[model samples]
Target chain A: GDDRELAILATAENLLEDRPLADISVDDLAKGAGISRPTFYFYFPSKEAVLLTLLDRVVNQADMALQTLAENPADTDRENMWRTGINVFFETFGSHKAVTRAGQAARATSVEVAELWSTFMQKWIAYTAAVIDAERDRGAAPRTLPAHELATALNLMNERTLFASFAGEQPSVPEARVLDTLVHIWVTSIYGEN
Target chain B: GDDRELAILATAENLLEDRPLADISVDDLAKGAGISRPTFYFYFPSKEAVLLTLLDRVVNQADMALQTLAENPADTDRENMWRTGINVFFETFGSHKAVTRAGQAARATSVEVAELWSTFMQKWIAYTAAVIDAERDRGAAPRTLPAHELATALNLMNERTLFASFAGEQPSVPEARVLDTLVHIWVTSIYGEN
Candidate 1:
């Protein structure tokens, strides 16, 4: 991506902090980025395209965090491993809360964004399942359920809880507490009481 | 509501099956309900109003289910009680998938709907917390964390999992399995295995 395109993406993200995607105009995005409307369109077709571009960055960061979990399958400190996984996960999402809110809002109307979200989610689910499978194999987690199903439920819990927390839907919750609660659930659900 | 109003609500929900709340227009809703657009406005102020009204009905059904749980706090068959609660929850949500989706979409843009959603969620969280508190009092569940926080996390898990399942985000998973997975998490999270 060109630096100018990156600049436009940054402007759109900043704009999202105060208003929703629907509230921000393309012209405003262009003006904020010191580009003409035509130039903005030249780089990205629409505001949603800009959003998708931004989300790609956020998703990559999240994907990288989950990948770390995969690379160290035999880490002795499973609790710390899961905690780091969640810390990085929430940190990435907390920084881009506005863009995420925009993506979630557009998900109902934009098939492209929806598919992107679905794909992004499936990637995380697969990674989480891999971890659960390893844990179950080592007798670190229960084998009562399939790895994928357990991962699916746990991942959805983290995703929804974090989204709600960032969106201020769950008002007055401390960020650390939120992370702790999710980590507790993830650890307990998989490892049970150790 | 009057019979005419009820007819309009039914039509709106039916339309949502194939489309989102944002896609459905007041004219189409009026036409589907055999009412003039003016009459549609007479019954509801906007499409969101219609969604909120429909949500109230579904929420009541869900409330009734929770109320049953509250009424039988001392049931020795606690597992069955929670299972019944989960069954009613998924059934109600599955049958009215469209309205729930519409409510989710509307939640992003409409303040009234968002507030309504927040209120509805808070009520459930409070109810769930009470259950956890009672369980803790009877030495059924652990008291490592606040009952309300545990309840909040579990409720978000259920909300997110059900929303994704109904939206076709999670494919090939049996509804029974989804219900069981959630019930398992709820039971384990609240009342750790003996």
Candidate 2:
């Protein structure tokens, strides 16, 4: 009596619990969901399509949270904006951590999925650049450099720090510690020692 | 009168002119060099060893220039040491541009080669970090963050900017432009904007 969509989601959830998304076969998913191979193809083009759907869900949730953090955001205030933005960003990462990790790993494998993620990241950076420009205009941060450069730096910081933190050598540092230290390093680097 | 070694070098140069080092075959090298097939393996373990020999020559030349640059070095008053170091580094790439370009392109092919370059880079960063620490000690630069992070930033700048300039939609930027822009970006980003 389970709905077809629920059957699919349940099958996917069970499969993810057992193995990574990449190893999960479409044939297996179809069988688990009580659907024929053709029926499964009728819904999702490929396994990557399902992963993209998960990415959209994560992005949607994360962006909603980010909106609240950006309320009354100012530009030239480098320290405070970075602190808040990192907090919201990590919080979003926490909710769908597994899916995001898998999606990132998949980028190194699947060309179609990589392109999809690349487009998403391009838009994400452009949006971040715009928000930074707005914040700078509001005198929330110092107009030290262009928004695009700042956004690029932010991405690099996030990437390197996240990979280090995820490596889990120093569990005591905590994700919060990771974000805080990164923000401190970045802010001070941008604003200089006063 | 050319011999096997010259033949190998000439063949490598010609092969690289057509495609990457990874794509070149022992047979191709031997044929191009007018040597028998087994003769190529007598001099080198693999294609990578030949590449390593080529890059080692270029790096050794660069190291000599760097040593000279340090002899009549910048004063302890500003970020001149960092600026000079980068200029000297890029000079190697500029003069032997194609060979260096080949090294850079080879990264995507061999993890072993990538690791070799990464070690070379880490050591360079360690040396740069030492200089930055000395500058901070002299009160010329802020002592806000660890010197290693700044070194990482500078190292990354050279790699990313160089690769982008080389392989981007347009040709690599002019040598002077690359030096000036990178120096400005590095000094401003690390020492903070005035």
Candidate 3:
């Protein structure tokens, strides 16, 4: 088992290189890794689970990035919290662009699997809601909209941003401008002032 | 073609009344209508297409209920607008519950067909965005959150509301609760009170 998981991952990645991920099969992965079908099943449940495994690796990196933002929350301003979080997320996603593309493509292929992605996003939205709550607890914040509403706004922007990035096009706005679309929504709605 | 379509639809509706919409198949529909498979194909592409045809009927009714609101925009308050829209949607859905349910369930079952539903929702969101823009032009909107973001928030709530309505064992909540939840978010954030 020393390199068994790695062997499977490597095999999966190799198959991805030759064609779109949707084109590959679990049998292809197992054959490429030199494992039996049952062995592949023993290690992973389905083709989607393999994709999930890869996604777990990628998302774990993002979790670490978000944890870093949390650690220095008091030291930085509100904009920095969003800016660093998104920048770190984008950078991590950049490192695993293939997985990002494949995962999204798979989401288009099936709804049950798309729920896996959407559920992850919903958790992120909840976390953002908590962050908004914390900001409101501070006297520096103005009376704003409900944290849940703000969280929903953030989630929508996140999906839109990911779609744009996945399309291989950068938005015309600067990073700050990207942040502002979300930030302004949060700030103005909550504070009631521009 | 007219009589054939009507016959099939009537039979399908009868089948739906006796069983869950999920149980109704293309073959069941064809057989029930005393038609051959090819005749069924001539009228509708698939079982799902039949559901879509039913959905079109229901949504068209809902759309008609909205005609006054759209045509006489300035005359209706936002609260009245929501009441008109939601009631019309609910009443229309009530009339074709089985077909509406089947059509919605198809979004979870078929990817390309789900995209059609998604596109339909986006148009609704766009309409919400336009209303926000209009209110802002009149200096009625107090906050600066973009019209699109507000529309997205509305869309998210609409989704949550629909799920609750579909799954609830009881009247999910009074219609007031829905209106309150929606208007609370709008009044506080958009009207700058929150």
Best by DockQ: 1
TM-score of 3: 0.64
Arrange candidates by TM-score, highest first: which order? 1, 2, 3
lDDT, candidate 1, at B28: 88
**Residue-by-residue lDDT tens digits, candidate 2, B88-151:** 7776666656667787666556676666666666667677778777777778776655667556
lDDT of 2 by residue, A66-155 (tens): 666656656654567677766665667654556666666666566766666555555555666787677667865557655665555445
> What is the C-alpha RMSD, rounded to one decimal, of candidate 3?
6.2
lDDT (tens digit, per residue) of candidate 3 on A30-146:
888988888888788878778877767777778777777666657765555565666666567766767876776676566655666666666776777787777778865654456
Question: RMSD of candidate 2 to the true fold?
Answer: 5.6
Off by over 4 Å in 3: A1-20, A25-46, A76-125, A134-194, B1-22, B27-45, B73-101, B104-115, B141-194
lDDT (Cα) of model 1: 0.78
Model 3 alpha-carbon miss at residue A97, Å: 6.1
DockQ of each candidate's interface versus the true one?
A: 0.42, 0.16, 0.11
* Positional deviation of residue A189's Cα in model 2 after best superposition, in angstroms: 5.8
Clash totals, every prediction: 0, 10, 2
The CAPRI-style docking tier of model 1 reads: acceptable
